[PDB]
Design an enzyme around this catalytic site. Sequence first.
Site: not given
Lengths: 1084, 319, 265
Positions: A18, A563, A572, A609, A616
């Site tokens: 080629k 957990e 919150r 993120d 928590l």
Amino acid sequence: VPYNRMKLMIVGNTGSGKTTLLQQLMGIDVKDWPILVLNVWDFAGREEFYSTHPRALYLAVYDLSKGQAEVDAMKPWLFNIKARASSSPVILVGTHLDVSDEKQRKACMSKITKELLNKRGFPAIRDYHFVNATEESDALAKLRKTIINESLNFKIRDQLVVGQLIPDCYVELEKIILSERKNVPIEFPVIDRKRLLQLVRENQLQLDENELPHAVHFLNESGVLLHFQALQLSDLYFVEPKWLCKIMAQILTVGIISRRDVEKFLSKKRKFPKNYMSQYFKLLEKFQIALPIGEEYLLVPSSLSDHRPVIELPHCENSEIIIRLYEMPYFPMGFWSRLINRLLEISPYMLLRPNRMYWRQGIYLNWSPEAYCLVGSEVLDNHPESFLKITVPSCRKGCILLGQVVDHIDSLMEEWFPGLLLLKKWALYSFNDGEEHQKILLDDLMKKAEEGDLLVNPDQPRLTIPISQIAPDLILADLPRNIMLNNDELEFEQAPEFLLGDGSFGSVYRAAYEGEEVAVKIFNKHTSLRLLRQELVVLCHLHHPSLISLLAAGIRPRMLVMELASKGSLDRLLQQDKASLTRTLQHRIALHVADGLRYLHSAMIIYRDLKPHNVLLFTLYPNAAIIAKIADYGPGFRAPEVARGNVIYNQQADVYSFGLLLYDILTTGGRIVEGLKFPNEFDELEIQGKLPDPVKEYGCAPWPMVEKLIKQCLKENPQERPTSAQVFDILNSAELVCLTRRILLPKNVIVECMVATHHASIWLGCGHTDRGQLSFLDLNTEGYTSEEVADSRILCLALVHLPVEKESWIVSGTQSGTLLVINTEDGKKRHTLEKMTDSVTCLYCNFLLVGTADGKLAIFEDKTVKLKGAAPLKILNIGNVSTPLMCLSESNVMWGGCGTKIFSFSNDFTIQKLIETRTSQLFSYAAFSDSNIITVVVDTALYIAKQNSPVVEVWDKKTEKLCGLIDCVHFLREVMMSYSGRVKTLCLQKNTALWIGTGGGHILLLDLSTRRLIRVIYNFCNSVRVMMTAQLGSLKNVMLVLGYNREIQSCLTVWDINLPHEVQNLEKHIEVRKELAEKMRRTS
Amino acid sequence: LTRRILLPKNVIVECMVATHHASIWLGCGHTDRGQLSFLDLNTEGYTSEEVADSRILCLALVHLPVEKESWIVSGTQSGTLLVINTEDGKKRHTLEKMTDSVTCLYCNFLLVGTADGKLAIFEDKTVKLKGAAPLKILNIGNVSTPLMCLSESNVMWGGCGTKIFSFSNDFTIQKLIETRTSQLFSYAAFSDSNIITVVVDTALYIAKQNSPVVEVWDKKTEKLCGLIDCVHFLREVMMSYSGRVKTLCLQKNTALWIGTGGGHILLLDLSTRRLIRVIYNFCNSVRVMMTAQLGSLKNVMLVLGYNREIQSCLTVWDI
Amino acid sequence: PSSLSDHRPVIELPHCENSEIIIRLYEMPYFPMGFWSRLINRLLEISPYMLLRPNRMYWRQGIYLNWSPEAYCLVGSEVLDNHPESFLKITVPSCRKGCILLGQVVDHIDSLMEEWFPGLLLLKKWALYSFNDGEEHQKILLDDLMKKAEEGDLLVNPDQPRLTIPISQIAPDLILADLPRNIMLNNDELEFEQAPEFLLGDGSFGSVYRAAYEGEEVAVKIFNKHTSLRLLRQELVVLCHLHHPSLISLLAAGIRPRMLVMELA
């Protein structure tokens, strides 16, 4: 401007010829072809670039005289093309027709009409031709026409989908850069000076944060230069394609080879910096040229023997082993080298080194007759499909090995060969040793796994096989003992009232396990098993106290028991109870989050993120071992860098996000979070980076150190932002917690004395000028004023408080010996008391005691001082003209310093004892012992600091004896001419804390009950001037430390009086959690 | 007496029973038909006579000392049971055909475990009757779950699939222990397997098919007491030794003998769970081990296995 | 090495403020070459531990020594503009270790003044001091300082009494604060009458009596105006490391009275 350049890709298998084809038409032979200028890349050889770093036309070439077999060989090429550019045009050209009978021509013609031209999975071959020879042909004339017209058609297709044509306009400045990069003469063409080159060409594409990234992006896609974006030789190292290709390809050809011998050769071939050499080796891995074996060796996949070595396996009866097959139509190019790289790290003990062997098409690990593993390619007659065979011994360790192998195989395909996800997974089994194996698809075994039954021979019930022996990875038999689900403990209902939430994975319910509150993730018909195992792989091996751990998993209903937080999300809390959010709690939360980030970053995991929703809380009790944890590890809150949508996430993105979290913690109102309600401003605000002052803007009580941390954290440049390890180290500080305020004084202002008003402001003296100047600081507003009130320099201030008369006065003793007394409620009420015979050296006040430079002590009656020219009640001669009084302490007997003697007074102002302290020179050093006393601290012993001493003397007032020495130099000697060690002031707290200031910016905290160093507070300022204990207007007790910061800068620092306790408590807290981290990691 | 008794080349035995009064009845596993061979330990004589169309899966001795007679019951693949008097080999009796093949026998009355999980009970003197019906039949397992271990060691422990049964004096299921819960320990492929041998003293010793470990269960609380890792012991020894357990024998002095699929036999102290010693290279593959008493009253272990040219070998091992 | 030049390297020192260091000067127009060779031979003996081999830097006419950030000792020749009379200069930090280093050095220099200049005793001894860090220093002839040593008070500025200095800083080797801790004279325990009844003998330095130091009969050597202070410490140098049962032990010195307390039996 209308860019008219397009790449030409010439591909095919070795032997096609080629390259000559290209020459007639006109690693990799790269060259321009003006017709439209094509950038032709001739992949004549095996240049992995088409997979290792995959506006172009694909010319596929094959030798027709070889025939249909070659056509099939091109399927991997077509796959790879579609897999990276399904929209790109493909022209298929067969060659050597002059030595190929038309039988083959039409055979291959029918072959492609039956299997490629109308076959999905291949990139819709646009056209095709047959050529006699590379000497030239009418076919080639047609091909040239085809290529031109089709490349035009392709760009039309791009306009239909992408929105770009063959004269698509691109920013002209990028075009200029291309030309600038063309014009580069460098011996070792690795570029960093590009920044300068930007400055050479004036300064185009000046948006370094956006335009620069786009230019670079363009430059790789256009084939101009190469970024390598987690390599070190990535961002600042743009490398000439010719060298990349040439050198790496040659080194391959220059099969286990020691790294060092490679280094030896390379150093002679091209003298690369050793730093670059380490990256060179990393690139060899990246580009699949050579794989790391041991730290001293390379595998070099290419060229490995392709004659599978004779391997005698232990175990022979069918029931002794487990076999798994993967049926494929063909292996993708590079499939095996990638697979091998992954499989080399397998180990049944990760929860002696193996006798490894390599086939090119397979790996044999030995370890022990007990547990070993063989993975390799095998092909059966009448079955065109190729396929994998995995063999492990049937026992627990064998299972563990199997699990690791199939997890790597599936992960490999998901990332690198999607589209296949074909891959017909078969399991082999037999109902009796000595017989032949039978095939079954894993999907059907999953159907049976749901039943939980034995595999039963449908024709003969007597013949059964436990599923686990066939497929111990469908049933989770490779879990650590610690997480196997005990079905007698787990108690749950899956009822609506327990639903905690859901997602694409299924749903989450509240449940009980071993008496504790847990959350249960259920993979409720969502491509389960594979998702389940992916989560299991991530959760295991991450065992940090700040992360949510896995409390057993179970295949029977496909669950992860984890957990459950008891206090819920930070978000919150921020909008629920500010009373819980105390300064102490806030600090501890910041620590726990920082640890998680450090850990995950060391684990090469980007969180991407952080936000209050993912934090928590497990107890609001401030003094708990574990308070905050990061949820689901493994919006408008984005770094401005990644917010562009054109870069790659890394640790610096997480750091930026962390800074925002800290900002949100600082302002407990969540004021920027409230800003979210108007997202058009909120997201842009973060992008701008123009955040308002958290104190001034929100009315938030000052918290220096943290305030500057946030500023340091939230920088625009990723390379200037702190690492997460450093962020933690900064948070790890008692000073961080207890420093409350810092007020700088106006430039060239020197204050030699301080009087805080016990009721929120401070009266300041001024030794900068040679004039009696009195200043005043308002702590409520950090306001500052100053006025000249007397002739000679003010030496001492004292507050006269007459709550009975409802008034108070400032007594200013000065060098002239006068006493200027000023009403605090009325600046006009100024008067002078009887002038002293010498300067005033100290004041104390009830009686106003005036200690003068001639050793004379004047005692004034409490209220009498209100009158101008008032005389004292009585006067004592304690010292003499050369022995000034310098300290009146009292903690109702007075104590004080006069030269080298310690005096004491009764309530009748009589001398109760004159203790000569000079005699202490028998100990320590005479020039320290024989020196004027600066200060006296009265507790259960006297603490004496003398002028220019580095040693504090401890005296027993009950027997008048020296009871110990405190060597300040020693303490800072332990610490690695600012270290003068000179003692400046002594303050004493009744909780045993002893505060010692010094010549340099250090404050020593000593334990009075043991005479031991609690901590060295330092790098405070240049030098400590005075220290006071004072109660604020909010009834808080603080230390007021006034110091020098020579540029004669001076300033007032306010410390929370509980610093000594915070130092010790913090240290304990950290150590406990450190031990827990090791506890967890060690269990595994 | 470690007597190395060899049988003719390619003789294969699938079952056996010794007369407890000196000879052994052996099933002709090497044939395609129920043939019953017979070994005379007093003369080392060996003969054979055909007894059934299908192969013999289990032999058992029925003895009525009050009737002064004894019989060998042949449980075959056909599900039929042929009763053969030993005082007169032509005096044969037939017991009612089972619903599936007979996997095990235990004889007062004769217990008959079948491939489909049934337990037929034949009253002792029905041994003299042809076309004899059973005293009682229990529904224990099913066609996918065979009954195979009848271990009295006065209640009967039943090995059926993955469950352990305990039967009363009136054949009531006193206890039922499903052993699948043992998966928390060991390995599921082993745990989930059909029970082959049940040995009981103070605890239950469970040999499951193709397992390298033996489960130990607490008959008083129905809990797993521990595991005996056979392949570990062979690991301690410096595909011939797969470690798969073939048979468990146990003498009241805690002498646990574990015949493996290879040439090793483990002797283990159950009072401390310790390996006492190992019989080395006994034969190429140990098949079964029967505790027995010779004509001399000597306590011996009838270790029967192969020296594969398959060579059956019975060693009258000295206990 | 005597082949070195008189180069004086730009070494940054700790203790940069005036009160942080002690400066002792020895004036004489010229100290004939060979002096400094004998001086460095005596200087390479200094060791405060005796009551470490640091990065010393010999300057031909003096030496750096280094010792430590805490305690160091620079010794060497000097000359000032419009002050052709050369002089020796010693710099040690104002602390006991510095005092010890100083004390050993000044004894080595005077030992050399007895050696290199036998009988010359020029060689004017000055205490360089200031009343405030950053100010210009002033010199005190040690003879006059010794007159003040008898007074026992601070250096008091007669014009500004507010400025006083603890004399031992001015001259650390004046008052023996650099002795082994065990021989510092406890002035509350020296029961020394000084009456003729306590005479044991005499000597060129004065006379020898006895006392009940710490309750024990001891011999007392009074340096009675015959080169006191000096001879006293020179004897202490001899007594240092002198340990044998047949010899008379040192049972505390006493620079304030200039009276050595010795073993008596």
